[PDB]
Write a protein that binds this ligand. Structure first.
Ligand SMILES: [Sr+2]
Ligand SMILES: [Sr+2]
Ligand SMILES: [Sr+2]
Ligand SMILES: [Sr+2]
Ligand SMILES: [Sr+2]
Ligand SMILES: [Sr+2]
Ligand SMILES: [Sr+2]
Ligand SMILES: [Sr+2]
Ligand SMILES: [Sr+2]
Ligand SMILES: [Sr+2]
Ligand SMILES: [Sr+2]
Lengths: 171, 373
């Protein structure tokens, strides 16, 4: 694949269309304010495109009125917890990667989306994932926090769970 | 070849340098930090630098920040620095953190040379961990402490410099681990005042072969003379308590010292200079009977007021041959105590004076020292 452009979202209402090539959509923060905002419209276009959504505030849902299509991979990183359901909308998404540190994850992926939930310093926070194609849970620093896969909707493909605990607190 | 200057913003930046020598600037914009959540920096080819400077304290690497291909990272704050670069930072070989009148708490990756420079440290504490080679350069220290490797040892050498010009006793200095350790103290108090320097504790790890601890020479305060007292020194091999595990610290160097102790089954050589109070030498706690029982004291301008003691010999297996080599400037050892010593050899090109000795098992003293003993 041929590299395309980097498309940074803003704190205003964005309407971003990628290039026929491999684009990277950056949905960061501006001085502590999220740039994925109400009404944002993202369209990846042709090629293998990626959306990097990173913000200190917790992820609780896609903002109101947001439309995302044509973007094959979505990376979600928060400074707090992640609660997100991509099993409808986000047309063309095939890989969802969600990343927290010291915070819970509650993620449902579409039956055609490979899900990778990576949690550092999970401790007493719980990780729950549902849906997805192939599902991967990679958790370190776990203590009493639980790990639950597929309690509401099973993975369509394989399930791989890794849980690491360096405390004396029963995992 | 000179490259580009790449200023970060208060937003999430994605900056890739050139194939040349670039400078990434993470300053302030109207008081707001520009190394912020989600930033992605790639230096590319060439020798690249990131200058991170802000008046506000540095409290952490922000969420989602990744730095790659940048060979040097300079961090300067108007307040304290708290920073862990052991994740998200690929390719960094030099991390330099700079404060004045504020604390530093820094953990570097095992492949990153760390230099923590603190001016006017005073009562603030400096704590560094991780890193390859670790360097602490501290001035204007008063009661503030200096601690290296309490959580994760340096992969390479450790060098600590602590300067105090007050009369407030220098805060304790502790180093744990490293391939070789040097703790250098200076006292710069004015005449007719007395400053007590910091107690120093150095605990080796599996890689520590040599430890050096130097201070300003002791002196009595007078109208023309600044008074100084030396701090205690405690040096411990990581295997000092084991019955089976071999030691690693083979050489210790003390340049002026208060009450000093060494404990290492691997110790063969001690270099001494300046004003010393006392030195007790232990050889660990191995059960097996040792075969190498030679202790070399290389002295150079040394004056001790108390005893250099083989603390192992009385109830365990001490040194049977003691070699004292005097160099450059005459030395005076107040008392030499060695209960297992049978041969005392005194060599070198500077006078060696042993005011008194307690070594009842001696069968021979031979002096080759060209100046005399
Ligand atoms: Sr927006
Ligand atoms: Sr595209
Ligand atoms: Sr696409
Ligand atoms: Sr599209
Ligand atoms: Sr930024
Ligand atoms: Sr470069
Ligand atoms: Sr690079
Ligand atoms: Sr580079
Ligand atoms: Sr012993
Ligand atoms: Sr023994
Ligand atoms: Sr003995």
């Amino acid at each position: 694949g041929v590299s395309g452009s980097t498309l940074s979202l803003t704190t205003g209402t964005d309407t971003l269309t990628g290039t026929a090539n491999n684009d990277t959509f950056v949905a960061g923060e501006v001085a502590g304010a999220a740039t994925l905002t109400v009404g944002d419209t993202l369209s990846g276009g042709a090629g293998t495109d990626v959306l990097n959504w990173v913000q200190a505030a917790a992820v609780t849902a896609l903002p109101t009125g947001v439309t995302i299509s044509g973007i094959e991979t979505m990376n979600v990183t928060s400074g707090a917890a992640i609660t997100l359901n991509t099993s409808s909308g986000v047309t063309g998404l095939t890989a969802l990667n969600t990343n927290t540190s010291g915070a819970a994850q509650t993620v449902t992926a579409g039956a055609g989306q490979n899900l990778t939930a990576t949690t550092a310093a999970q401790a007493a926070n719980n990780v729950a994932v549902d849906g997805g194609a192939n599902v991967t849970v990679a958790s370190t620093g776990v203590t009493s926090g639980t790990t639950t896969v597929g309690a509401n909707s099973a993975a369509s493909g394989t399930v791989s769970v890794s849980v690491a605990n360096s405390s004396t607190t029963t995992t | 070849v000179s490259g580009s200057t790449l200023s970060l913003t208060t937003g999430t930046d994605t900056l890739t340098g050139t194939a040349n020598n670039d400078t990434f600037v993470a300053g302030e914009v109207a008081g707001a930090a520009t190394l912020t959540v989600g930033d992605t920096l790639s230096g590319g080819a060439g020798t690249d630098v990131l200058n991170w400077v802000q008046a506000a304290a540095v409290t952490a690497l922000p969420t989602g920040v990744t730095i790659s291909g940048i060979e040097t990272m300079n961090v300067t704050s108007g307040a304290a620095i708290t920073l862990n670069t052991s994740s998200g930072v690929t390719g960094l070989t030099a991390l330099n953190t700079n404060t004045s009148g504020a604390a530093q708490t820094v953990t570097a990756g095992a492949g990153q040379n760390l230099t923590a420079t603190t001016a006017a440290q005073a009562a603030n504490n400096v704590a560094v961990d991780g890193g390859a080679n670790v360097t602490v350069a501290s001035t204007g220290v008063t009661s503030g402490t200096t601690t290296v490797g309490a959580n994760s040892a340096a992969s390479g050498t450790v060098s600590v410099s602590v300067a105090n010009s007050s009369t407030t006793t220098t805060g304790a200095i502790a180093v744990t681990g490293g391939t070789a350790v040097t703790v250098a103290q200076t006292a710069g108090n004015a005449v007719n005042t007395t400053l007590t320097q910091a107690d120093v504790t150095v605990t080796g790890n599996s890689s520590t072969t040599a430890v050096t601890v130097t201070q300003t020479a002791a002196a009595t305060a007078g109208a023309t003379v600044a008074g100084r007292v030396n701090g205690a020194v405690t040096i411990t091999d990581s295997a000092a308590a084991s019955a089976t595990t071999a030691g690693k610290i083979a050489t210790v160097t003390l340049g002026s010292f208060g009450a000093a102790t060494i404990d290492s089954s691997a110790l063969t050589t001690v270099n001494l200079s300046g004003t010393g109070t006392s030195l007790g030498i232990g050889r660990g706690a191995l059960t097996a009977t040792p075969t190498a029982n030679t202790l070399t004291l290389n002295v150079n301008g040394l004056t001790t007021t108390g005893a250099i003691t083989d603390s192992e010999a009385a109830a365990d297996d001490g040194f049977t041959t003691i070699n004292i080599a005097g160099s450059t400037a005459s030395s005076t050892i107040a008392s030499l105590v060695a209960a297992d010593a049978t041969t005392l050899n005194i060599s070198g090109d500077a006078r060696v004076t042993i005011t008194s000795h307690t070594a009842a098992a001696l069968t021979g003293i031979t002096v080759t020292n060209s100046v005399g003993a």
